[model samples]
Target chain A: GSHMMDARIVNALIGSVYETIRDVLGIEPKTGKPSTVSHIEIPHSLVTVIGITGGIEGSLIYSFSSETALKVVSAMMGGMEYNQLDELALSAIGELGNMTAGKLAMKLEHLGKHVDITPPTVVSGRDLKIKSFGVILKLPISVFSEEDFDLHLSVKSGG
Target chain B: MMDARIVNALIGSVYETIRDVLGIEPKTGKPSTVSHIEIPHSLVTVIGITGGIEGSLIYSFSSETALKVVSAMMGGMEYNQLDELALSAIGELGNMTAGKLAMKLEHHVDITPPTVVSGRDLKIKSFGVILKLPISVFSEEDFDLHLSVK
Candidate 1:
């Protein structure tokens, strides 16, 4: 069943994504118009998944290219260059997702959607496959005027 | 309704139910813990809450483990698939735990009916903080108990 996607939900998600990257990671991200994708494919190796439930239920997946992931993680750690993705870096990235979604939840609460967020699960691979029953919204984000990443969302209200 | 430690009240009540109904002594870890382990693509039950605590309790278990649990609860009734019977059983367990936790919490605390999600590579998203507490049942079968609240 296709559920209605209102502007409130859309704006909160967009705002949350932009604010989290800027405020928490201290990295400025430039994003363009959002597009709906027929299928899901992760272009980056590092992906973070966070689950949501309550007024609406589904998940948000943040996919980062190697360069962007490393740069963001490095900025999160005070400019420490990382050649490889370590546990600490992953944890930080997961926490970053948590913070991002956490803020969105707070905003949604004001909009009458009381939702709960799940802990983040971080994974890395060259290419990954993900499927969801709900709709998938893909937003492209650019960092450092070059490297790009994607924030993919698949969420819907309960039947 | 006590405004006291709600998480403890939930953990204790859920622990008791697993011990009493399923005849499984669950091993519990610290409360408000964060885990990175992948939540296996299996049977998952989420109970929503409102009022006193605006959050949810997530119960995750492998399909095999779920069968064992349902069988144990139904006095050895077999459950080989994620059908209505099996999911209903798990949903009831979630309701029981959430209801008990709500009863112990503030009067305003209200729990929604259990919601069951089943699939492979299912992604979960939320805006609140999610803390996972590890629980071991049957000594070997493990379950990740997640509490998400704003």
Candidate 2:
């Protein structure tokens, strides 16, 4: 159950990202190889964290560089040019995170694993470090061969 | 329901934890809601909450306050820098406070292990409003507690 749950959660998260980008941004994204790490040092300028509870408990974190965030937000806004990470841009990114996590919960439910996600917490900074007691699954996604972002899922089964 | 109940519970837990763990009395300042979450301090311990209420419980501490806190937790040992052990102490502070908060709420809530982040120019945004409570310890040293729960 432990290993099976881990793979299920990872698959759900990856599928959530794929569907969110394809549906919301109307763009196809390429998924990179996934790996497991003890922790992650987020060098990106923008990050969104969502807490997961219930059968599974941990955090869902999305990281994007400034340029990647602007591009993604612009695409989400129907091609509106965004030069900076303003309130509007941050809000858009947070919405993206919310949608992704929402989809993740739904997907998990289908697999007989019930879960709920907290409201997305968006953060912008440099040299951020996040360590989880549980193993962290890292997935890298790329869009348009340039815009890239990373997804980190740090979760474990709860009693 | 208003967030005051949750705020009060958190405040009580923090007060009790500090008093019991560090043997220090902490004075809580007036709490206010803020639009953004900025960690102006040098050290911040973030613990994610799940279950009955969903959100984050954040503890922010200045460099000096963090050092003092670590020292107090270590039986008045001198800590000039935020080494791994010192950081771990700060993380435990958040963990103990959240654990007490869970008990005070009398509800089933799970908290993730603390993530200690230290840096400059740190800002966080949440879908829900963030409540900031300034806490003063050691008479002059101060720290901030932020809650963003829905």
Candidate 3:
């Protein structure tokens, strides 16, 4: 007998965290306007990703545009705009992924659970079709946009 | 043989582009950071990651950081902040790597359109594990990447 956590619980935890980020950033993450169906408007962002394993195996893609990312990283870099696309900057952000996921995982762990995550990586500008992986989960983050941005959360449990 | 051409190609270009741009000794493109930054902040970035072939090709940082890299690489000027020229060159770092890496793939490979990824709260997650590249270098100063196939 296998009993898995339902989507509702998953959504609640993940969605709250995502919302928290938006609130902290002082931005209301919206979904796609007229172009997309009501559900499309969400996880408004520029796509950056992170991975987590253990209780649930999956990846998280954070959203932001080029300019927006610069603004964010600039603030992190002590209010200076990043002008070089180099190694240190990428790894710093990668480390940030570790931090964000660690925060969420810690919350999940409080429920007597744990997650093992990998080093963060980056993906950009590709309309991907994920096959082989039977379930490709998506959670559209509604912020403020008419674009198809998402905060997709997908996972696979024990076989 | 798995050939691993596509995977190598994607990373190799990243390796070559930076080496060529900075004019450093060419090393294996096994997917890892080479060094940390000399400047005080972040700048331009471009990343191309592969899941099936297993790896990531990234061009990250801002222009300010990049100008510092350029000055070091060419030993030409005492540049500090990234100007427009530096920014374009940084894009080249991403563009060339994606193009050349795809060229080395056995299967029909494609890179995502050129876009800059900033070093912020960015993340890359996958269901399964991504391959590691067993190669890296210690640049003048910045960071060290240990890219390997796991």
Candidate 4:
């Protein structure tokens, strides 16, 4: 019960950590509000993967709507809209994964924990499925808005 | 004396690390601040690399600049402008240096710390050569900087 709330904190903290990642990457939120990758899409883009063989592991992914995604690219390029999402652009998405993984890894470092990340890999298509880590406990956070959204997180036991 | 060579080697390693290792190819010019990294820019791609080399080397990159560089690296992948991918790739850039430096350090004085910091509006004032870097002039008020770890 309380663990769910804790997940929300994790999500919120994750958001903050992401803020740092965005800063270091030099990615700014286009509008007044920071662009969000709803928890659902957010987790998918980053959540569980082949890479996790450490003390208590998981993944966090992000999936933005096409419109939001494009707007983001525009904002990122100083409002210069790109016609198509080229190879380099998509690879940038994977880079997002790598960045987030690094951020998360840093937090782990604070706790004297070590977790390496795989190169970010972004896949196309709409249909998505995910299974969040944490047995006997799951606090799901669903995000919604004009385009952007976010995911909050938490789990029981470190192992 | 040996500083110039080591410095050039550092730059070369940075280029190759970003290109060859991290797979982040260069678009046109070099991977210097001359590159555009969009801001309001996330801490402008700051990475403090510390390890068993000579001293600590920090790379403060601009996202706008990296956009062009990383886009080139993606090759056939989607090249968006968001800082996430750009930042992620940059971190790899730092990691790449660590990888290369590990070998290069074998010929260096020593090796010790490795740090990587990423943020925005990070209070930063280049002590000796904040503005002066790489000896290239982007504007009339360009700067100067050229040094390498022992």
- CA lDDT of each prediction against the hidden true structure: 0.67, 0.75, 0.44, 0.38
Better of 2 and 3 by DockQ: 2
- Clash counts for all predictions: 11, 0, 68, 58
Per-residue error for A49 in candidate 1, Å, reads 0.7
- Residue B54, model 4, lDDT: 27
Each candidate: RMSD to true structure? 7.0, 2.7, 13.6, 14.8
The estimated TM-scores of all candidates read 0.55, 0.88, 0.41, 0.37
What i-RMS does every model get?
7.7, 2.3, 11.7, 15.5
Supply candidate 3's per-residue lDDT for B148: 26
Output DockQ, candidate 2: 0.57
Place model 2 in a CAPRI quality band. Answer: medium
Give Cα distance to truth, residue B23, candidate 1, Å. Answer: 23
Residue B59 error for model 3, in Å? 17
Off by over 4 Å in 3: A1-5, A15-47, A75-79, A124-134, A142-149, B1-150
Better of 2 and 4 by DockQ: 2
Lowest summed-lDDT stretch of 10 residues in model 1 chain A?
A: A124-133
DockQ score of the complex predicted as candidate 3: 0.05
Identify the CAPRI category of the predicted complex in candidate 1: incorrect
Stretches of candidate 1 above 4 Å error?
Answer: A145-147, B1-150
Q: What is the iRMSD in Å for candidate 1?
A: 7.7
The alpha-carbon deviation from the true structure for residue B30 of candidate 4, after best TM-score superposition, in angstroms, is: 40
Q: Measured by TM-score, how close is model 2 to the native structure?
A: 0.88
Better model by TM-score: candidate 1 vs candidate 3: 1
Q: Candidate 3's residue-wise lDDT over A30-66, tens digit each?
A: 5321111211112222355554445555444455455
On DockQ, the leading prediction is 2
Give one digit per residue, the lDDT tens place, for model 4 in B1-150: 134555555555545565574343433233333221112222222222222222233344433444655664566365557455655565555556656755654552322112223333322221122211431222221212222222
